C-alpha cells in the first residue's frame, strides 16, 4: 500500500499528540481528579444528614 509521506505525517502527528496527552493524563490529570472529587465528596453539599433540609417548596 502507498501512503504518501505527508498523509502518513498527518497520522504520525495525531499519534504523537495522543501519546503526549496520555503521558499527562496518567502522570498528572488522573491523580489530580481523584483528589478533587475525593474532596467534593467530603464537602457539606454532598453530605446532608437531613434530606428534609433538601426539601423544596411545592406551593399548591
Amino acid at each position: 500500500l502507498r501512503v504518501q509521506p505527508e498523509a502518513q505525517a498527518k497520522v504520525d502527528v495525531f499519534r504523537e499528540d495522543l501519546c503526549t496527552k496520555t503521558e499527562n493524563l496518567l502522570g498528572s490529570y488522573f491523580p489530580k481528579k481523584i483528589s478533587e472529587l475525593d474532596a467534593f465528596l467530603k464537602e457539606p453539599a454532598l453530605n446532608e444528614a437531613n434530606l428534609s433540609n433538601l426539601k423544596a417548596p411545592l406551593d399548591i
Binding site: 501519546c19 496520555t22 488522573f30 481528579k33 481523584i34 465528596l41 433538601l54 423544596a56 417548596p57
Partner: protein, 140 residues
Amino acid sequence: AVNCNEKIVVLLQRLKPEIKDVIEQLNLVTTWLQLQIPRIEDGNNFGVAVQEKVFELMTSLHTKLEGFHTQISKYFSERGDAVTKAAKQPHVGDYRQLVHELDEAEYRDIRLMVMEIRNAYAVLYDIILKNFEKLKKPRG
C-alpha cells in the same frame, strides 16, 4: 410558579462538567490503547491478551459513565411532570410526595455519580500503570 430544587440544580452544575471530563479522557485513553494494538501475528500474543483485558475495563467504565450524562435531563423531565400532575390533581397527595422523592433521589445519585467517577479515574490509573510495559510494548 413552582421552581426547580436549587440545592440540586447547583450540584448538577458542578457535576455535569466532571462527567464530560471522564467521558473524554476515557475516550482518549481508549484510542491510545487501540492504536497500540500490534499486527495480528501467529504467536506471541500475551501482551495482546493484556491489552484486551484492560480494554474490557475501559469499555465497562464507558458504558457505566455514558448513562450519567442522560440521567440528568430525565430528572427535570420526570420532575416537571410530577409537579404538573401534583398541580392538576391537588387532591392526590402522592404526587406531592413523588416530587420530593425525586429530589431526594437525584441528590442520592449525584453523590453516587461523583463517587463512581472518582473510582473510574482511580481504577484506570491503577490498571494502566500496572501493565504499562505490555500495553505499550506488547511484544518487546
